Write a protein that binds this ligand. Structure first.
Ligand code: LC5
Ligand code: LC5
Ligand code: MN
Ligand code: MN
Lengths: 410, 410
């Protein structure tokens, strides 16, 4: 019986997590949903509580706390512990009844909850790539202290890589640890990308693309921020750094490859040169489920992959001239220090400016480049609390710098 | 140090095994070649002995024993144990200085040394699919007696399947053991085929194909017998039965798929519907090496897979009208009993008749079908020695029956 908490239970990751839990539990009772946590979606939380009957309920916005307490009286034979805010989140993380926590929260409230799950030696199913990019060294330090805590990757490509590894080796180590790649005999990673909507466009066409071109009738329905990052390939740039931190793979041994069918989710080359890959239809339920069943697998009723129907799988190298965000991500990763923090923060600003029609496509990369060029390496604090404060300071500095560059140009 | 014996060391599997051993040992001294066994290729064995300096040499043909003794006197600082025939093979199998035995002896004959390797509780790297098809239930019985013996598959597709599995699960079972697929969470197998030289021919074109057409300017240089089996797709038919026995996968859960690029070597669908595949250039060194390093991997200097250069991977369903041998193999497998023994034996004859221009393409499947129809199931012996005698008797009966059908129609 797997006891699971879901943080951000009404977002995309949270609802896909509950969907696969529901469907798997029909086949065999495997999961007990112990806690649900949302920002302010009190009615959606009530609907989930009605079905899943968790021991804990938490809502971040305290203005809707009483509104939740009244609604929950409608559910029969049910007396949950209803909590509020950061203190509620912390009480859930500290509960002995919870084994695994799904983090479906974007940005730094995601990092904050991840931190407390780790301090409580839980398994943390983590989808938030920006938290790993911006606080990777901090998370490594925290995981070295809290020896039974584990991050299990949910980002589709990183789940794929993790699924391609031998658990007889994985169990000797854990993600976001030094020497992970040595212990697992990993030589190199093929990190698969959809390529986004702009692969066939010329440099002159890219000059004029808008956020509407990136968002309009998309091949893959996703959130706006990640859709823009897919269009610039900065999504893959961030995922290169995510790969480096999760699996301790050198940047020279991570290759971005454009695979437009999105059936192969990534591939691992081992030291003998044998390559293992993971494949499925594009569907977050498989990566989410594996994060909750690892090191085992369980039965689902998902549609089986029909390779004959798929028929063709294609691969090509991305053009760094057309997708300069990729090069910027490698440069930041290789420089190390807090350059990944700076990359992520400046991209947060540049992405949103492009989304709102304030800058052009190549201005995204120009702004990010200028902020990276302005940053000077800082001595990394040995003290965990000071290190988190450095990450926050540098994140804020980089956002401000990106905004200042935009303001001067405008 | 991994202590290895190579049986049939001058054949294709044996020479590829020594090639990858040589290249891996240059990087780090990991293998000791303890024994080499050949039928009669005395000069080739001498050359291998000069390089690898094995403790044991064995030659099957007693008429070249004295010649081998005199040749070996030329090698400096070297006093091997020089043995002959079946007795020498048995002595090598019983040596406490040998851990792993590569069986590179073809056809029904390779079963004999495989049996003795298992009786001595060795790890047996088995390439010979005909042995597994013709004596599958016998090998299962023998492996249940000799608890510490293991068969590790070398046939490229079966190595691929094995490499796709989690060794944390594999180590709790073994190939040819009941419940192997359940313990490994296997749902279904995609068994990849090149499709062979006749894959795109029309029915009218197929009727006229000759063995010269199959053997001329081949895409892949291989032995004549397997090349004919690739042309008829009986190679994959045999490999379906091999999959069933090795991994305890139901015939309804094995799908043959034509993958003409021969980069993906096969794929495993797990019970959650996630699919894992193994990939490399067509090269027997990877399957052979994995059989000798399992459950670990070691460094090689093999060419890394360039997926962007490969560019395209394709998949389609084979036509059973054009490749009726596939249907015959599934039918024989599903019937069980000694039908696989009969399939293999009758195919041995039909393959050779077509090779030597005595029958046409569709006569191959006609002969096999008629022999299968003629066979009457026998009560399966409980005693392992009686069971082996039964397999031998049925093998001989089926060859003679195939020949008799040919003689009638000729
Ligand atoms: C899904 N995922 O982890 C992404 O990063 C988005 C990525 C893959 C999109 C295709 C895809 C792949 C796997 C699962 C998906 C689930 C929902 C929607 C899309 C899915 C876009 P990119 O490669 O161009 O950077
Ligand atoms: C290699 N192997 O295990 C075969 O059964 C031959 C098979 C695959 C041939 C391609 C291939 C695949 C993998 C390794 C190879 C090594 C040498 C030559 C060819 C290799 C032909 P088929 O699929 O049409 O039945
Ligand atoms: Mn991703
Ligand atoms: Mn094969």
């Amino acid at each position: 019986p797997i006891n699971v908490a879901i943080f951000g239970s009404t977002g995309s990751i949270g609802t896909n997590a509950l969907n696969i839990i529901r469907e798997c539990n029909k086949i065999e009772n495997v999961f007990n949903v112990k806690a649900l946590y949302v920002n302010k979606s009190v009615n959606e939380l009530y609907e989930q509580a009605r079905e899943f009957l968790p021991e804990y309920l938490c809502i971040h916005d305290k203005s809707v706390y009483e509104e939740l307490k009244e609604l929950v009286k409608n559910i029969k034979d049910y007396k949950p512990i209803i909590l509020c805010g950061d203190e509620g989140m912390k009480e859930i993380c500290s509960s002995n009844s919870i084994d695994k926590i799904v983090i479906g929260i974007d940005s730094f409230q995601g990092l904050y909850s991840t931190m407390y799950a780790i301090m409580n030696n839980k398994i943390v199913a983590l989808a938030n790539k920006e938290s790993i990019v911006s606080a990777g060294f901090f998370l490594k330090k925290l995981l070295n202290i809290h020896k039974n805590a584990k991050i299990i990757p949910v980002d589709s490509e990183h789940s794929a890589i993790f699924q391609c590894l031998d658990n007889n080796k994985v169990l000797k180590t854990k993600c976001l640890q030094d020497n992970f790649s040595k212990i697992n005999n990993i030589n190199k990673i093929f990190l698969c990308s959809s390529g986004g909507p702009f692969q066939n466009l010329t440099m002159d066409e890219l000059k004029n693309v808008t956020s509407e071109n990136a968002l309009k009738h998309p091949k893959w329905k996703m959130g706006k921020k990640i859709t823009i990052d897919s269009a610039t390939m900065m999504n893959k740039g961030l995922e290169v750094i995510e790969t480096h931190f999760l699996f301790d793979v050198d940047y020279n041994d991570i290759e971005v490859i454009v695979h437009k069918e999105c059936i192969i989710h990534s591939c691992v080359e081992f030291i003998d040169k044998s390559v293992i890959s993971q494949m499925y239809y594009p569907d977050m339920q498989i990566p989410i489920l594996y994060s909750l069943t690892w090191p085992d697998r369980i039965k689902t009723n998902l549609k089986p992959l029909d390779l004959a129907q798929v028929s063709t799988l294609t691969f090509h190298k991305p053009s760094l001239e057309h997708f300069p965000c990729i090069k910027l991500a490698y440069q930041a990763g290789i420089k190390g220090n807090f350059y990944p923090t700076v990359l992520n923060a400046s991209n947060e600003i540049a992405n949103n400016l492009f989304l709102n029609n304030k800058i052009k496509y190549f201005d995204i990369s120009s702004i990010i480049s200028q902020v990276l060029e302005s940053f000077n390496s800082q001595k990394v604090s040995e003290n965990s609390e000071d290190l988190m404060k450095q990450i926050l300071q540098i994140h804020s500095w980089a956002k401000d710098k990106a905004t200042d560059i935009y303001n001067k140009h405008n």
